[PDB]
Amino acid sequence: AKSKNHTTHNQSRKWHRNGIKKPRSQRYESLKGVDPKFLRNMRFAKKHNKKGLKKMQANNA
Amino acid sequence: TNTKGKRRGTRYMFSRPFRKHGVVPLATYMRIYKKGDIVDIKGMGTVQKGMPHKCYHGKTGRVYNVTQHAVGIVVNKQVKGKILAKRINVRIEHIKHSKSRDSFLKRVKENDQKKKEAKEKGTWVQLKRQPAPPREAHFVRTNGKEPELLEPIPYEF
Amino acid sequence: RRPARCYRYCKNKPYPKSRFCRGVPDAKIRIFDLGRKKAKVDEFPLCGHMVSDEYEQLSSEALEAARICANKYMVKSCGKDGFHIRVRLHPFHVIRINKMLSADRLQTGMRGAFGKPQGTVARVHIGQVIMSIRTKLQNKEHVIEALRRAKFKFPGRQKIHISKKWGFTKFNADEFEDMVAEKRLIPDGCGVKYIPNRGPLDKWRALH
Amino acid sequence: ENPMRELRIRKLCLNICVGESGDRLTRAAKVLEQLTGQTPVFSKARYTVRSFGIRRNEKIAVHCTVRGAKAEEILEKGLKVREYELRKNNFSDTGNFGFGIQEHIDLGIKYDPSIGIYGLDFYVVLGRPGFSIADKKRRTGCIGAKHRISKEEAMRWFQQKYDGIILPG
Amino acid sequence: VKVVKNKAYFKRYQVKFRRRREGKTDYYARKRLVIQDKNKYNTPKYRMIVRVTNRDIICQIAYARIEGDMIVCAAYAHELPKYGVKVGLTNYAAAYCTGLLLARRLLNRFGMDKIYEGQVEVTGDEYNVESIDGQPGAFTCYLDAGLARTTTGNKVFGALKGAVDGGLSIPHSTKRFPGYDSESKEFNAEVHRKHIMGQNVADYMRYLMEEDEDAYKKQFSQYIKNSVTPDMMEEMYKKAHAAIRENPVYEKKPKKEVKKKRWNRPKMSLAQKKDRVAQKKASFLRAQERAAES
RNA sequence: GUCUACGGCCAUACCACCCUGAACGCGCCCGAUCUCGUCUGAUCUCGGAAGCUAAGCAGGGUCGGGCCUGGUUAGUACUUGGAUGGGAGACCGCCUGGGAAUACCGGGUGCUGUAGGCU
RNA sequence: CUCUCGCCCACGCAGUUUUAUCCGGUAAAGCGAAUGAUUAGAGGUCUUGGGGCCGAAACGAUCUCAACCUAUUCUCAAACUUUAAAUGGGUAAGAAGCCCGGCUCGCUGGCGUGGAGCCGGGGUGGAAUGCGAGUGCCUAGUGGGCCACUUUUGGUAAGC
RNA sequence: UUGACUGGGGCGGUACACCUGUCAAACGGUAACGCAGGUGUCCUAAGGCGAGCUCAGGGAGGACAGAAACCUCCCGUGGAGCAGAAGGGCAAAAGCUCGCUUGAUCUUGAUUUUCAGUACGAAUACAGACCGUGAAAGCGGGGCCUCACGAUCCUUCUGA
RNA sequence: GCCCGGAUAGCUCAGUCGGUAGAGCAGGGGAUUCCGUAUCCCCGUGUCCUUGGUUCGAUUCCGAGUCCGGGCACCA
Ligand SMILES: [Mg+2]
Ligand SMILES: [Mg+2]
Ligand SMILES: [Mg+2]
Ligand SMILES: [Mg+2]
Ligand SMILES: [Mg+2]
Ligand SMILES: [Mg+2]
Ligand SMILES: [Mg+2]
Ligand SMILES: [Mg+2]
């Protein structure tokens, strides 16, 4: 009752039977695990450019 | 069976090459990495803290995070039947700037300055590159002398 | 001791006597030069080799039987101290023995199969020399006949070649004497110390 | 004719090497302070060999380095008991020398049976002005071959000052 | 016949650096002094290179770029006789006066003159400049002594407080100025200001009048050169303090004055050193041909 | 033409030895009253300027040693892919492409940034 | 199911090459380069290990085997290596790009510095070949394999 | 109720959880009761930080003192040491000596390793605290890196 | 014929602390005695199994062979 231990035989042609895929790297990646002091700044910079911007830029635009 | 331990098959690759030991030079630390920079991974052996893993040594990824002493790199890694984008935190001594895009960033420079260089002059420069063509019908010269006759030499031990 | 049919063709990676083997008996050859070893360079001009045709393993024991056979013919012809035989290839590969029944099924089957150190062979490549004498040029047909008897104690196929070099040196014997004459070679015993012309200049002044 | 390339007593280093620690070594430092007037520093063994009675981190000897005019003040005491004659092989290949005495009572020390007899090793190193760049912290450098001193040069120093006899055989 | 130290030692020898063999740097301390955090990306990290030598003290402000260090401003002590201290250019008071010259030259270059005065009269106490709200921020900087031992009273900390009194923000502690008690924990500012105006070296001139006048001609001979006397000296540095605060700009000489060039040998050519060999080989063979036969 | 302070690349820069070194400097050098540190003012810290290029240091030299670079070794050794090729085998040749390494011989021997000084 | 092709240039993709860029320590090679094995002679002699020798005696005198050192020489290494292939692995070959101006920030801080984000604006022809792609749910069987080149481990060998 | 693996089973051994070099065929992965060994600990310093220093070995000198005692000078690219198995790494050092200390503490996420891309263990990069040390830059949340360990239920102690 | 310990005087035997060659018998000479027996003393007798390694040091430690005694030993 001794058997066969480990092969990678037949595994290369079934990896390609559905064809190994790049995960397509879309625009706008997530900010999952950016360092927190940088991220905590960057949403303070996103909640004041929506308020205190669009009178002194709409003239310049 | 086969010892699934970190830093396993690295007798030669986490080793300083030959006669380049000692404390590491300082322009390595004076390298500036921004987001989206394309860096290539090469774990050294003197600095012990932020070596990635032997899975990534030799590979090339993109910066998404910049820290005080390290850089967050997304690399593609081959697991069995699919690849995955893995984000690995590597200290700054184990990476460097990859020149792999810098032959494309030269010919977006010398392409756009040459695109408008013919727009002002009205030609058809065809700035798209072709691979090595078959050779031109040239005309060799054998001036004066004669083509030297060579013959296969005999056998000796 | 098994037949050398069993321990022949280079099937394993080389298994030298080192700090991992630590059990291997000593080879039968322990001396390697048997002629007049004290002889100078210019005494024996020509050498003669025996060269392999095939990539096989010659045992350490079979190199002993050939040097006794080649010494015996040439003390019979060239006299004691009229030649210099050098057995050139050294046994470092250690062949192994899986000594079973150690008429019964008692010990194991193939369970702990990795052998015990049995003996030493030498891994010989195609074209590599095995033995080589050097003699006077008046001994030329005793070069072949010593090296034609000593190939009946080796497995496989060997070939006898009288070399174009000056003895056991690396230099061709046509322009050896043209080159040892003025400066470029100096004799130190049985070999030749080629001197360049690019050192410090006081050891050019030590010459002349 | 030779300006400021000249020999001088760089330091003088003395020791007694007692076979053991304890009472016998505590008053060996009483004597080497009686010569020099400065406290000895206890040297201890790093080898445990057990045929000597010696032992690791066991204080085995006393020594000091005396420098300056008090170096040559002790040295003129030890040469007039060795009668200003040395042997030629007391001179090292780096030039510096030393001779050693037995019975420190022959030196200016008065005998006291509570202390006993100890032997010294006087060892003299010679120096030129400029030898200190080998021991400087900031820009440490080698000394240069013509500026170091030899065995053959220090023996004609000993005949110049202290006018001694080399006595080779 | 004895031993062989180097035969393939050289084949496997790894030199340290150009600057470690020469003994200037260490690169263990440099690596911590000179590199910015990577998330700051371009902001220079400034330093204060204070190097005392024989007969001079050099104070520089550099920062680290990949093609070499970039020095902003530099103050010396052979510069110092232009302001009033003509002699004794390596004491603790020429160290302080170089540092205040190094500080005032920087803020004048940056335009931060009128704000950030620092401390005009020297009490010697630990002052620590603060950045004013609405004004351009203070120049933060980090002292590096380099390879000199930093105990108390080391005059590399003399230039440290000359810089602090000029309006430079340097992190430090009073624990290594002269006047800090080692077995206690107190600090004496009165000892430190006496050490800063040069009455430690005025008392030793008073110690060499009334003890041995003959050693006072050997040492302090170039205070007897012009006239420097131990009552005049404490006022004499205060005038140097008040004159480097009102003129730090360091004009440069017109400096042309020469067209002269040759002082050392050039590297001789390949053919000149190749024909030198055969000119030696010919000169040896005549010594054996003619001078062993006749 | 070079240097000093700080550097980058880290031997074409190191190593052994021998010559030369104006002027600034760097340094050896002369002292312990203070600051400080020693068994010892030798080192380390502090006061200088009476002497010195002797050394370090800088240039240059050596049919130098290494180091760097190039030939030769050599289309050699290996190797991709192929054959109902050879041979009892071990191994081998050819096809289609890629292609080293040592001895041996040749040539080089620091290059530069910032700031300040001499000529 | 989501879409793309129906009538001067693919969105997208790839068990492929090319063009640039790195990564590695296999084969080979090396050991007159380190580590570890290892044969031979040559030259110089501090030295001890012993003899021939003037000799009551004498590092006063004449020598050898060694030993050590120097320059050489033969032969090696899956658990050695300076060097080092072929085959191979990652990445890049554009509008999700390039550039300009402006606004936000509590982060950074000599500095209207640094860096992120945000808004508005300007110009698309950017290796070869081939192919229509994207995505979700549900899901059975299988989880004893065997063989042949080539490369390999144990074994004398095996249809092992 | 009477383990499993197993060149049938038993006896033997543990290849049953794990780490190092090799096999392994130059990214990674890769089997056998393949080879050479190792682990179930040790450490209030052998953790932390700063300073000063240089190692193994050899040569030549020094009273006893000799192959090995201590003293000095010179050479010394790691031939030493780093708690222990190996491999990697390290010289104004990661080694030796000394001075202070407790970051071997509190807290939330992310990432890596094995991997199904689950967990444990180990680890990396942070962040918010409170601290140590150093003149400062800084470094530090255990040991120079690769191992040194353990669910549910139950119990015990601590926390508002 | 697989492994475990041995190899020492004319013999047996201990050890050969990494630094000697030692009990005890056989032999030879003495001493003792009236003469003997026992007894006592002494002198001999070591390729320390060969070869290679490991330090002013190996028979002693390591390990290669040979020589010798003692044995790992299933169920079918
Ligand atoms: Mg004192
Ligand atoms: Mg004191
Ligand atoms: Mg002094
Ligand atoms: Mg000089
Ligand atoms: Mg000179
Ligand atoms: Mg030179
Ligand atoms: Mg050369
Ligand atoms: Mg092929």
Curated annotation (Swiss-Prot), chain A:
This is Large ribosomal subunit protein eL29. The modification N6-acetyllysine is found at K32. Residues 1-25 have a biased composition (Basic residues). Belongs to the eukaryotic ribosomal protein eL29 family. The lineage of its organism: Eukaryota, Metazoa, Chordata, Craniata, Vertebrata. Component of the large ribosomal subunit. The ribosome is a large ribonucleoprotein complex responsible for the synthesis of proteins in the cell. The chain holds residues 2 to 62 of 159 of the full protein. Transmembrane segments: none annotated. The modification N6-methyllysine is found at K4. Residues 1-31 are annotated as: Disordered. It is found in: Cytoplasm.
UniProtKB/Swiss-Prot annotation, chain C:
There is a cross-link at K183 (Glycyl lysine isopeptide (Lys-Gly) (interchain with G-Cter in ubiquitin)). It is found in: Cytoplasm. The modification Citrulline is found at R30. CDD domains: Ribosomal_L16_L10e. Pfam families: Ribosomal_L16 (PF00252). GO terms for cellular component: cytosol; cytosolic large ribosomal subunit; cytosolic ribosome; endoplasmic reticulum; membrane; nucleus; protein-containing complex. Component of the large ribosomal subunit. Mature ribosomes consist of a small (40S) and a large (60S) subunit. The 40S subunit contains about 33 different proteins and 1 molecule of RNA (18S). The 60S subunit contains about 49 different proteins and 3 molecules of RNA (28S, 5.8S and 5S). This is Large ribosomal subunit protein uL16. The gene is RPL10.
Curated annotation (Swiss-Prot), chain D:
It is found in: Nucleus, Nucleolus; Cytoplasm. InterPro entries: Ribosomal_uL5, Ribosomal_uL5_C, Ribosomal_uL5_CS, Ribosomal_uL5_dom_sf, Ribosomal_uL5_N. Its main location: nucleus. There is a cross-link at K30, K44, K146 (Glycyl lysine isopeptide (Lys-Gly) (interchain with G-Cter in SUMO2)). One of its GO terms (biological process) is positive regulation of signal transduction by p53 class mediator. PANTHER family: 60S RIBOSOMAL PROTEIN L11-RELATED (PTHR11994). It is linked to Diamond-Blackfan anemia 7: A form of Diamond-Blackfan anemia, a congenital non-regenerative hypoplastic anemia that usually presents early in infancy. Diamond-Blackfan anemia is characterized by a moderate to severe macrocytic anemia, erythroblastopenia, and an increased risk of malignancy. 30 to 40% of Diamond-Blackfan anemia patients present with short stature and congenital anomalies, the most frequent being craniofacial (Pierre-Robin syndrome and cleft palate), thumb and urogenital anomalies. Belongs to the universal ribosomal protein uL5 family. This is Large ribosomal subunit protein uL5. It comes from Homo sapiens.
UniProtKB/Swiss-Prot annotation, chain E:
Pfam families: Ribosomal_L18_c, Ribosomal_L5e. One of its GO terms (molecular function) is ubiquitin protein ligase binding. Its main location: cytoplasm. Residues 255-265 have a biased composition (Basic residues). GO terms for cellular component: cytoplasm; cytosol; cytosolic large ribosomal subunit; cytosolic ribosome; endoplasmic reticulum; extracellular exosome; focal adhesion; membrane. The modification N6-acetyllysine is found at K2, K45, K217. The modification Phosphothreonine is found at T229. GO terms for biological process: cytoplasmic translation; negative regulation of protein neddylation; negative regulation of ubiquitin protein ligase activity; negative regulation of ubiquitin-dependent protein catabolic process; positive regulation of gene expression; positive regulation of translation; protein stabilization; regulation of signal transduction by p53 class mediator. Residues 250-294 are annotated as: Disordered. InterPro entries: Rbsml_uL18_euk (IPR005485), Ribosomal_uL18_C_euk (IPR025607). There is a cross-link at K217 (Glycyl lysine isopeptide (Lys-Gly) (interchain with G-Cter in SUMO2)). The modification Phosphoserine is found at S182, S269. Keywords: Acetylation, Cytoplasm, Diamond-Blackfan anemia, Disease variant, Isopeptide bond, Nucleus, Phosphoprotein, Ribonucleoprotein, Ribosomal protein, RNA-binding, rRNA-binding, Ubl conjugation. There is a cross-link at K217 (Glycyl lysine isopeptide (Lys-Gly) (interchain with G-Cter in SUMO1)). This is Large ribosomal subunit protein uL18. It comes from Homo sapiens (Human).
